[PDB]
Design a binder for this molecule. Sequence first.
Ligand SMILES: Nc1ncnc2c1ncn2[C@@H]1O[C@H](COP(=O)(O)OP(=O)(O)OP(=O)(O)O)[C@@H](O)[C@H]1O
Ligand SMILES: O=c1[nH]c(=O)c2nc[nH]c2[nH]1
Ligand SMILES: [Ca+2]
Ligand SMILES: [Zn+2]
Lengths: 28, 458, 145, 48
Amino acid sequence: IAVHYVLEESSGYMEPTLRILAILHTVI
Amino acid sequence: FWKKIIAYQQKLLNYFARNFYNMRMLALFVAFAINFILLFYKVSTIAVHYVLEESSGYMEPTLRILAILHTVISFFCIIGYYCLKVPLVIFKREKEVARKLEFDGLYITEQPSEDDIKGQWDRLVINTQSFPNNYWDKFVKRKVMDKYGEFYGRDRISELLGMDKAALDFSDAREKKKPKKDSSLSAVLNSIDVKYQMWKLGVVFTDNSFLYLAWYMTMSVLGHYNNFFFAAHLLDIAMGFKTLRTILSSVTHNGKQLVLTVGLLAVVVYLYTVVAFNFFRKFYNKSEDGDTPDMKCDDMLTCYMFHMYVGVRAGGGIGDEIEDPAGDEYEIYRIIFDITFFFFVIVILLAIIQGLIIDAFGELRDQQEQVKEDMETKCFICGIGNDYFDTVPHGFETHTLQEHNLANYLFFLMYLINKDETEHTGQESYVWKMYQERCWEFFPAGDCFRKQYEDQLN
Amino acid sequence: TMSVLGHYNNFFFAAHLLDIAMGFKTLRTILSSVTHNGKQLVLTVGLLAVVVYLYTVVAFNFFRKFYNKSEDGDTPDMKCDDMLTCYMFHMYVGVRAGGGIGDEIEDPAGDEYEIYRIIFDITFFFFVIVILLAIIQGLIIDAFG
Amino acid sequence: YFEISESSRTQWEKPQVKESKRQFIFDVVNEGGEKEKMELFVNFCEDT
Ligand SMILES: Nc1ncnc2c1ncn2[C@@H]1O[C@H](COP(=O)(O)OP(=O)(O)OP(=O)(O)O)[C@@H](O)[C@H]1O
Ligand SMILES: O=c1[nH]c(=O)c2nc[nH]c2[nH]1
Ligand SMILES: [Ca+2]
Ligand SMILES: [Zn+2]
């Protein structure tokens, strides 16, 4: 079976926010 | 008529102030009795009803009477202590703010640092027709005006203090004041100072013990809405007894350390949750049957909740309450996982959290014991050790009860205030000047009469 | 008197094995440690009683359906249908339990009061088991020391 | 300097006197105040 780790988000903005935050963390 | 009603009202206030403590212990009985009665409810039948399982049958009217009595007694217990300790708090704050105004210029030259709630709040009482109401110094405004008026502006100082600069010389010329009777109307309107009562009420609501009494009264009132709200009054024994006060204070004594170590436990359990959610998901099936799986780690939130709620409380960690790793490719990894969880979370961090509070309790008890041990080993005033006096029988007791008694010092200060300025003796005038100038070098510090005359006396 | 009662029932002679406590000094110290902090121990036991009573009140008012201690669905052995039995259950079981009352009551998964009951169980385990029981034990241990 | 009787020594060495002395020593050293230590010691002497 193929298992995927996916956000259980209602607002839906967390994923791009998460990517931006990860990039910002690396830069910081 | 007005005189009679005022006399009766003041008598009632004095009675409540006198019997504040007795009414508190009566409230303690009433809480005990109400809760003992409450211990006999049961749920009956959907519409469920909470009904007493009583054989005698008198408990229900007794319970209602006791609840009403508790509310009345709590109201009396707030009116008392409002007539008892609120004046002391007001006096202390008035003295503090007056001394800050005079000696420090905290509202003329310094101004509060904008973070002190009380420093900011006390500005309202300065420009009040009755600034000193409990504080003895009724000329604090006059002396502040004399000290700071000429430099920083007499007009500005007078406006800040809400006073008249041209009234003092006229008063010294003639009094020009007339008394009046009280049956006239609007006299109370003229006499009342809404701003001063405002500031006083703010101080009272800031007071901690008044807040506790208000919470007690609020819970007593809520007890009529639901009789089980009277259970919160059983916590009053904690304040009633010293060791229970010590136990409760031990919880918040190491408050920052306890919060931070709880946060550390949270972080480490979160890390373990991440590891389990990424590698050990199939082991978190908490379903007894194979018909349907109750997976507790399919998502991070539920896995974290499971870890906190179960593994921390478990004796052996998460491994006690998760599946068995025998015969698996991740057997050794999961064994290390469980062992490290049990060691770091249960053996170490939980022990540290418990020990913080236990050691806080021990430290508070040891501090109380050290305080009690002191004043039995050295004098409060001079500080000389007890053995030096104890060379003679009952020496320390005689020194602390007839030579260096702090009660005697307080009585001497009262005698200096009550005595007229002209009739002070030499020593009395010396002490009085030093006290007014706040010079506390008249207190014997490391020396006493016996030590000074150690060879003349014997 | 116990020796005389031993003739009425031979098992009454078992009470004389406690005489070794007086015979030996360290056993006298152990027994004296129990009553050394007598007032503090009694008062902290009372505090534990009060806090467990508060937890019993909360459970009896909100978490009654979770106190079914019956293995089968044929008949329910409800332990919190009345305050007296709920309080007895709390004292007799939750205090002795390693993880608190949550060890011996139902599981709150998939319930509207899940988070409330999780907080209930965690706070019970922390205040009653981790703190108050430890304080009660430490009083006697430190008295012995 | 004075005279001690051998009978007095024997009675002092008897076990009950030793138990009383142990109890008194513990009482005075642990909780007995130094203020009336001599008073307690004289009382213990008279009882012994
Ligand atoms: N300068 C001092 N003046 C008075 N007492 C002193 C002073 N220095 C030390 N002490 C000690 O303070 C203690 C005063 O006694 P204590 O506080 O128990 O009195 P109390 O308030 O009458 O008693 P209780 O708490 O039983 O009501 C004594 O042990 C005394 O030795
Ligand atoms: O003064 C005395 N003290 C004693 O202890 C005692 N014993 C016998 N006779 C005595 N006289
Ligand atoms: Ca004179
Ligand atoms: Zn002194």
